Motif scaffolding. Structure first.
Motif, short mmCIF file in Angstrom:
data_model
loop_
_atom_site.label_atom_id
_atom_site.label_comp_id
_atom_site.label_asym_id
_atom_site.label_seq_id
_atom_site.Cartn_x
_atom_site.Cartn_y
_atom_site.Cartn_z
N UNK A 100 0.80 -1.22 0.00
CA UNK A 100 0.00 0.00 0.00
C UNK A 100 0.83 1.27 0.00
N UNK A 101 1.76 1.41 0.95
CA UNK A 101 2.44 2.69 1.13
C UNK A 101 3.44 2.93 0.01
N UNK A 102 4.11 1.87 -0.46
CA UNK A 102 5.08 2.01 -1.54
C UNK A 102 4.42 2.49 -2.83
N UNK A 103 3.14 2.19 -3.02
CA UNK A 103 2.42 2.59 -4.22
C UNK A 103 1.73 3.94 -4.08
N UNK A 104 1.89 4.62 -2.95
CA UNK A 104 1.21 5.88 -2.70
C UNK A 104 2.14 7.06 -2.48
N UNK A 105 3.34 6.84 -1.94
CA UNK A 105 4.27 7.94 -1.70
C UNK A 105 4.74 8.52 -3.04
N UNK A 106 4.75 9.84 -3.21
CA UNK A 106 5.22 10.41 -4.48
C UNK A 106 6.69 10.12 -4.71
N UNK A 107 7.05 9.98 -5.99
CA UNK A 107 8.39 9.59 -6.38
C UNK A 107 9.00 10.64 -7.30
N UNK A 108 10.26 10.98 -7.05
CA UNK A 108 10.99 11.96 -7.84
C UNK A 108 12.37 11.42 -8.17
N UNK A 109 12.96 11.98 -9.22
CA UNK A 109 14.27 11.52 -9.68
C UNK A 109 15.39 12.21 -8.90
N UNK A 110 16.49 11.48 -8.74
CA UNK A 110 17.68 11.99 -8.07
C UNK A 110 18.86 11.96 -9.03
N UNK A 111 19.77 12.92 -8.86
CA UNK A 111 20.94 13.04 -9.72
C UNK A 111 22.25 12.98 -8.96
N UNK B 33 24.21 11.52 -4.87
CA UNK B 33 24.06 10.83 -3.59
C UNK B 33 23.73 11.78 -2.45
N UNK B 34 23.83 13.09 -2.67
CA UNK B 34 23.46 14.09 -1.68
C UNK B 34 22.53 15.09 -2.35
N UNK B 35 21.34 15.26 -1.79
CA UNK B 35 20.31 16.13 -2.35
C UNK B 35 19.95 17.20 -1.33
#
Lengths: 52, 52
Positions: free
Chosen positions: B10-21, B23-25
């Motif tokens: 459930x939770x893995x399919x609901x949290x919004x996802x964004x791309x990373x470029x 190792x430190x954001x």
């Protein structure tokens, strides 16, 4: 016989202040900036008269 | 099959996802608008300065 003389120019002045809220309220005897200007002019004229 | 399937996730399919470029954001936050100084001044005076 001849001679040569010199005269030196001197400086006079005065300052006038009026707060911001005073210019926003109603006035009973006209605008205040003009009144302050007239008072300063007459004062400095009197000082000039006596300094002469 | 006597275990779970992918329909129970459930939770893995609901949290919004964004791309990373990297190792430190990094990201920036706005925590406050100013200090809790006095807000009332008296007549024609310069108010104090405030920073966020």
């Amino acid at each position: 016989t001849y001679a040569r003389k010199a005269a030196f120019v001197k400086f006079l002045g005065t300052t006038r202040e009026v707060t911001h809220p005073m210019t926003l309220v109603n006035s009973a005897f006209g605008n205040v900036i003009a009144r302050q200007n007239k008072d300063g002019i007459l004062w400095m004229l009197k000082q000039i008269e006596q300094a002469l | 099959n006597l275990s779970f399937t992918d329909q129970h996730i459930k939770f893995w399919k609901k949290i919004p996802k964004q791309k990373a470029y990297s190792t430190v954001e990094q990201y920036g936050q706005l925590l406050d608008y100013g200090r809790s100084q006095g807000a009332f001044v008296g007549e024609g005076v310069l108010p104090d300065t405030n920073d966020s």
